[PDB]
Design a protein around this ligand. Structure first.
Ligand SMILES: CCCCCCCCCCCCC/C=C/[C@H](O)[C@H](N)CO
Ligand SMILES: CCCCCCCCCCCCC/C=C/[C@H](O)[C@H](N)CO
Ligand SMILES: *[C@@H]1O[C@H](CO)[C@@H](O)[C@H](O)[C@H]1NC(C)=O
Ligand SMILES: *[C@@H]1O[C@H](CO)[C@@H](O)[C@H](O)[C@H]1NC(C)=O
Ligand SMILES: *[C@@H]1O[C@H](CO)[C@@H](O)[C@H](O)[C@H]1NC(C)=O
Lengths: 191, 246, 293, 272, 44, 246, 272, 44, 48
């Protein structure tokens, strides 16, 4: 079941405006939109989904994941966006001509206002540990980067600032194994 | 069920909402080289998953005083990824291409773009000198612009002495901002030789020229990017040797 | 202050025990012919090696250590927990339990994680305290409550870093604390007596570093300077002390100049200048100053 | 299905009309776009098991439930030590169990009793279960400790920990951890609704324990309750709580001092 | 290997019975009346 | 033929122009109680024309600094019409519900709403006090808002300590102002008991929370109401006695 | 084959062409010259068994693996005692296991706990297995000792030693004791490659143990780990190490002070 | 004499199963392509 | 180590004292002109 990712989890944000990816009209021909890690058992945007907590209850996961974006702008506002997944290796890509060598989908703003980037299973081993920290970077998954394909064009008498809601779920080949305790609660007040 | 389309090549996908029909250039699909037309003896390699995928280039801001941009397609992917690496090590090359040009706007913007391919798109020098030593010739960055692209100086003559009006004989598609926001062309391998070097010979080249200028009222968005995605379908490589850059 | 280096490489102390409460005595550095570190091999100092049993660091370790007597149970050497061995800018090591961290802020992981890269990461975002643990961590934050989990021993947090192999990057579940002002490039200093380090002090200083340290005291009579650590292997990069009233140079010290350890100057608007080169870089400075009112 | 899912070999498509990557999210359904309708995949025969992710293998853990103190003094003595049977006293099993609305299961209660300093001296204890409606024992020498028509367990401290099996005994068809209503009729106040959310279908009596002797025993025991769920069925899955617990029978949270579900980052245009 | 044997007259005092591999995911993923096809636009 | 729908229950009808697919909660239709699961002996009454119809509540103006609103559904229709009168006289109650939330705007407005149902939606008190006598508890107008409704104070935690992000497991629907203007959910009877009092127990509750804020340019309309219509499908009542209010 | 090999009756040959004793060793193969193609043998029906020389009967030995100290003081106390699960701490089982490259097996860990002076007082211990990724318990009264969704064993000192069975849980298809590579990408230094040979496919979590009591227990325990291999499969046989071990995770040896594989003799032309 | 009986649902908690007498020695002794005969010169 | 990426044969000095390197036809077109000079370097064959 898809669940709203928390991609805007940075500072200088309140609670409700924390689940929205701001989209504006950039003057330069190519700029970078929001980007985030794929690892669901890692501190970040995946911590806010149900799949992330379920993967937090276990220690090893497998199978493909699905990230579903959704444009919540105006009807007259159009544009194309590039959602590109990159396998492990180097760090986040700097520009679009480097990030477009991986797995990407061109998504245009039409009548249907939702695209679903699938994240394939390109791991060397069968299972990945949700630890993924420091010397555990052997089990990293990659980086999903959202780039501006053409632009966010807007007609006059129309607001030029939209938002994108990111959802996430798991495919049918999703597999979990080895039950453990979560790390979202360490202490507790005497009830 | 005609305005929506999802093209999947490799590990990439392109979804669309406002689309026309896909264009198949000259009614021929891009396939592999048969044994009757081939001439090399060594066996060619076919990755089929590592070079056959959608590569996204940069975006160019469509302004109001814009003339147009163009590209040499066997030379744009000459340095980007496994395709470029595999093309630097080999001497022979033969593939088709799948194109997709993204340009979205609101329902209050107006304009039209002409995106088409021209086999053997030769850039002509601009001048009125007939002496051999001073006759103007285009530089290497003008003939082969690379992954960035080049702009037109006289887009009415396609920078080649041939009028833009008569350029509708080529495999073309329109991007009308009131009808669609993308254009898709599938072009096969078009050459008089079976294989060829993908370094010192570009087979064809894309060109995007705004025929109707971009117009909008004061208050709407002003940054209109032009994004292009290319899939090298049915790629073949032969003659493995040292890697050369240019 | 006794240690002006992040690993205690220069510590000439009188500590002949491993710990003051619950410790075992150290062995002499001349009765250690069994081990490759003794005075029969290194005469004339070489880290400090005489006829004593003091906790020295001759091998370039992460902490000073002595030879303890082997009790047929493995360990023949122990780290010495010296209370007066901390560079000014090192708050100590603390415990780390779980999801509520001691440092509530940004986090960063890397395979090349030294002290100065984490200090610069926390400084480029205007954080007050840095922090690292287990060799691959960089915890930033501005909260004053970083001792919420307890104080850990200094010998417990001696896990080596990943970028450098002469610095302690905390430990497994134990975070070491650092303020972000260390190794910075200039700053308005208004304290009574603080220390000023070179750019990239735990590392070697970069090529082309130039900055201005300013020291103002609201009503001090005259200021006192010092030079605990000074190591320059070149004559092009050099340090200066200037007064900004009429903009004249007081003193110019470089690699070929041995600076005096202490002098007074009847000024209150001293500014420090450090022009580095791009040829040779070895180590920086640890200038300590003092203003008497 | 004993395995997860196999992958069909795919290829590229060059045609108009078929858009599998434009699944609308406004309909309230989940995107059903697979990998075969996208980037070219291969034939993989997956044999990864799905047995561990079932509900009976997920709720088959004991965990701590209750801690009961028994001082048994000489001048400030009580003798007995009752414990209301509820699962909301410790937030681990509570967080694991409050991700559903209605549950139905059995229990495998286990009692681990230790001394203050920690020592297993051969003292025999009496664990009594008082059903709702039965009188509670008042004193170490009361009339209720006869355990006639009442189940009880006699065990020593040097013996292994006792372990009994408990059936499903709620008067409703299933348990519930969230009750959006009131237990009785009448006018409800506006100041302090202390009876809101109370479900009488969960009061499973009281658990008492004493020391079987004649005079006294100057020893402070400390019993621990470990309940293993079995034969469990859950309905209406509910999201997992992201706020720290404050009370036992009330899901109250802090109005100010809110905890974000995800930690903060440096910038939005940065993965690390 | 036999753990299906009970030692009492009551049935709730047994161990975990035969595992059920039933997995209905469509009652949470696609709770819609018009069955959306896989290769089609969800709204027309 | 998918974007248009006309729902008819009793003597009411709801027509639509911009609609998504209807949502059936948990894939189960609301039906009558079978004899196997029932426990009461007296015969229940079934009007089937007088209580099974679309009841329209009030409208709430969607502002720009809005947090959200919620309702207790067996308690909103507790006083409105034949359904409320028939529910005051009876002790037992069992029915499903059909919902429809209206929110229309122009093609120049932007925003999104998340309308969903939560079985046993328990309101949590807001405070940091653990003493039993001062621990904050919600009032009766907060737990049961009536036909009017109640607003959220911290809609990021659903006023219950559970994050709004994870609330997508419930039967939900989106109202995106560029896609549709209504949302429809059909929910059956969900309870651990066959019958129950519709006065001191609410089975579930609707919640509407604007995830994307309402934005528009200066010159368009500013009053955006939120209208909700509810149809109590397959209603049953038992235990006839005196009428009680609350 | 339940027996070794039988011998065929042989005789003498007087003929040219057949040379069974001239097997070339330059080809990399082993000489296949039998006794029947040589000195005249007889008919022997050998019934010596080969069952003991199999791999499952060779690795079915426990051996010492780990020694864990637990002081549990009053002023310098820690409470817990973790032990990284690795086999390279004692050179006997390490020498027996490093004669192969890839192995795959199960375990039968056994824990023998004694006191400092040696005495079995009835103190109950708690043996906890912390998988890789789970938080480690910090203190004898920590939150992690609840053992919810975590396997643990409760046993006393007067009881027999505990014994559990452990499955194959490496993310790869088999274990490996020699990893010719690096765990992650990046630039590798020339001074001290301390991460070379490190295999993340062998970190089997951490093993912790405490004393279940309330206040303290002034006793220094010392646990011993005995791991019995079972269901073992080995690949790519490797020669046996002839040099003394120096470190745990590194096969370092002495450059000077080399140990010869065979002891010295008086002369080469002398058998004794 | 019966030690093939398991007492749990898991299979790794059993004892040593039936012994396998398989002995392929030719993959280490003669890893060559041309099969060298027993009565012949290995090189000609 | 650069020349061994093409077409090569290891030839050892044994009883047979002659090796025969074949030069395959790796041309782009069907025929090559024997001119091969200056601007005719399009029809070159390679280096042994
Ligand atoms: C002989 C002593 C037995 C001790 C155990 C008492 C037996 C009755 C246990 C009933 C099991 C109830 C499990 C939980 C019930 C309700 O959900 C909780 N009270 C509310 O959280
Ligand atoms: C309940 C306490 C159980 C204590 C035993 C822990 C269970 C996990 C043991 C895993 C068995 C691993 C055997 C060896 C693994 C790797 O090869 C070594 N760590 C490296 O030498
Ligand atoms: C340490 O040095 C001091 C010097 O004052 C001396 O009195 C003391 O005996 C020494 N202790 C040991 C253990 O060497
Ligand atoms: C080492 O130095 C100490 C102090 O001078 C002296 O007492 C001791 O005898 C010396 N040991 C040797 C072996 O010279
Ligand atoms: C400078 O003056 C101070 C008086 O406060 C004195 O202590 C110090 O020794 C002087 N420095 C020198 C180098 O004489």
């Amino acid at each position: 079941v898809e669940t709203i990712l928390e991609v805007n989890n940075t500072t200088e944000a309140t609670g409700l405006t924390r689940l929205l990816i701001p989209v504006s009209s950039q003057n330069k021909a190519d700029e970078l939109c929001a980007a985030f890690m794929v690892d669901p058992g890692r501190i970040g945007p995946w911590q806010s989904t149900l799949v992330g907590q379920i993967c937090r209850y276990y220690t090893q996961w497998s199978g493909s994941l699905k990230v579903t974006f959704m444009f919540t702008g105006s009807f007259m506002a159009t544009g194309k966006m590039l959602v590109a997944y990159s396998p492990p290796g180097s760090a986040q890509p700097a520009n679009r001509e480097t990030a477009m060598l991986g797995t990407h989908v061109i998504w245009d703003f039409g009548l249907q206002s939702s695209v679903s980037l699938v994240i394939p299973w390109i791991s060397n081993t069968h299972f990945r540990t949700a630890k993924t920290g420091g010397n555990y970077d052997y089990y990293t998954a990659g980086v999903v980067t959202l780039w501006y394909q053409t632009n966010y064009v807007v007609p006059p008498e129309t607001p030029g600032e939209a938002y994108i809601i990111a959802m996430g779920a798991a495919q049918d080949n999703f597999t979990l194994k080895i039950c453990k305790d979560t790390d979202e609660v360490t202490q507790q007040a005497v009830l | 069920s005609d305005r929506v389309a999802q093209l999947t090549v490799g590990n990439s996908s392109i979804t669309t909402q406002e689309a026309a029909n896909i264009v198949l250039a000259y009614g021929e699909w891009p396939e592999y080289c048969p044994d009757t037309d081939a001439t090399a003896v060594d066996k060619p390699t076919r990755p089929d998953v590592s070079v056959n995928r959608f590569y996204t280039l940069d975006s160019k801001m469509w302004q109001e005083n814009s003339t147009g941009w163009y590209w040499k397609f066997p030379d744009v992917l000459n340095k980007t990824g496994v395709f470029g690496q595999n093309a630097q090590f080999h001497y022979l090359y033969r593939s088709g291409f799948c194109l997709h040009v993204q340009c979205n706007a609101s329902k209050f913007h107006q304009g039209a773009l002409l995106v088409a391919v021209i086999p053997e798109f030769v850039i002509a020098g601009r001048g009125s000198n007939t002496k051999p030593n001073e006759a103007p010739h285009p530089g290497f960055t003008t003939t082969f612009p690379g992954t960035t692209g080049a702009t037109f100086h006289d887009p009415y003559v396609l920078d080649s002495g041939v009028p833009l009006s008569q350029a509708l004989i080529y495999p073309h598609q329109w991007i009308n901002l009131r009808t669609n926001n993308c254009a898709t062309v599938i072009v096969p391998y078009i050459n008089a030789v079976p294989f060829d070097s993908a370094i010192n010979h570009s087979n064809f080249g894309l060109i995007v020229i705004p025929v109707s200028p971009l117009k909008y009222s004061s208050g709407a968005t002003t940054a209109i990017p032009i994004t292009i995605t290319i899939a090298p379908l049915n790629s073949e490589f032969g003659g493995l040797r040292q890697a050369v850059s240019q | 202050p006794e240690c002006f280096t992040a690993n205690g490489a220069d510590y000439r102390g009188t500590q002949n025990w491993t710990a003051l409460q619950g410790g075992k005595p150290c062995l002499f550095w001349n009765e250690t012919f069994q081990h490759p570190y003794n005075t029969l091999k290194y005469p004339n100092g070489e880290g400090g090696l005489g006829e004593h049993n003091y906790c020295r660091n001759p091998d370039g370790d992460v902490s000073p250590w002595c030879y303890v007597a082997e009790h047929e149970d493995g360990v023949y050497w122990k780290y010495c927990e010296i209370p007066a061995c901390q560079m000014p800018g090192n708050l100590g090591c603390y415990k780390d339990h779980g999801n509520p961290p001691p440092l509530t802020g940004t986090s960063k992981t890397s395979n090349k994680l030294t002290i100065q890269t984490c200090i610069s990461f926390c400084r480029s975002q205007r954080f007050k305290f840095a922090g690292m643990e287990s060799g691959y961590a960089c915890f930033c934050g501005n909260n004053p409550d970083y001792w919420k989990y307890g104080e850990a021993a200094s010998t417990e947090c001696n896990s080596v870093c990943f970028g450098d192999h002469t610095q302690p990057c905390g430990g497994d579940g134990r975070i070491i604390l650092f303020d972000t002002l260390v190794g910075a490039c200039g700053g308005n200093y208004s304290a009574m007596s603080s220390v000023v380090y070179s750019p990239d002090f735990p590392d070697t200083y970069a090529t082309g570093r130039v900055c201005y340290w300013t020291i103002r005291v609201p009503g001090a009579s005259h200021i006192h300077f010092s030079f605990p650590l000074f190591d320059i292997r070149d004559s092009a990069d050099m340090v200066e002390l200037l007064d900004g009233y009429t903009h004249r140079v007081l003193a110019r010290f470089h690699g070929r100049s041995r600076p005096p350890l202490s002098f007074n100057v009847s000024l209150d608007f001293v500014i420090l200048y450090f022009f580095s080169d791009r040829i040779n870089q070895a180590q920086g400075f640890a200038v300590l100053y003092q203003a008497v009112k | 299905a004993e395995s997860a899912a196999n992958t069909t070999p795919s290829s590229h498509r060059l045609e108009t009309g078929r858009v599998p990557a434009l699944q609308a999210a406004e309909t309230g359904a989940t995107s059903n776009a697979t990998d075969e309708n996208m980037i070219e995949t291969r034939c993989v025969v997956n044999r990864n098991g799905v047995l561990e992710t079932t509900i009976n293998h997920f709720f088959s853990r004991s965990g701590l439930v209750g801690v009961v103190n028994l001082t048994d003094g000489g001048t400030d003595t009580t003798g007995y030590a009752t414990w209301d049977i509820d699962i909301m006293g410790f937030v681990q099993l509570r967080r694991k169990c409050e991700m559903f609305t209605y549950m139905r299961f059995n229990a495998e209660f286990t009692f681990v009793t230790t001394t203050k300093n920690g020592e297993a001296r051969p003292y025999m204890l009496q664990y009594m279960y008082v059903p709702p409606g039965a009188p509670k024992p008042t004193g170490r020498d009361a009339f209720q400790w006869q355990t006639a028509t009442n189940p009880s367990v006699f065990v020593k401290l040097t013996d292994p920990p006792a372990q009994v099996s408990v059936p499903f005994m709620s008067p409703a068809s299933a348990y519930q951890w969230f009750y959006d209503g009131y237990p009785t009729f009448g006018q409800h106040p506006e100041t302090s609704n202390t009876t809101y959310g109370l479900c009488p279908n969960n009061m499973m009596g009281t658990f008492a324990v004493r020391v079987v002797s004649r005079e006294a025993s100057q020893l402070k025991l400390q019993t621990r309750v470990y309940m293993k769920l079995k034969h469990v069925r859950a309905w209406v899955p509910r999201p997992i709580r992201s706020q720290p617990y404050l009370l036992k029978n009330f899901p109250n949270y802090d109005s100010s001092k809110i905890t974000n579900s995800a930690r903060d980052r440096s910038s939005i245009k940065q993965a690390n | 290997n036999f753990t299906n044997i009970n030692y009492y007259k009551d049935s709730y005092a047994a161990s975990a019975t035969r595992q059920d591999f039933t997995q209905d995911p469509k009652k949470f993923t696609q709770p819609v009346l018009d069955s959306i096809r896989e290769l089609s636009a969800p709204l027309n």
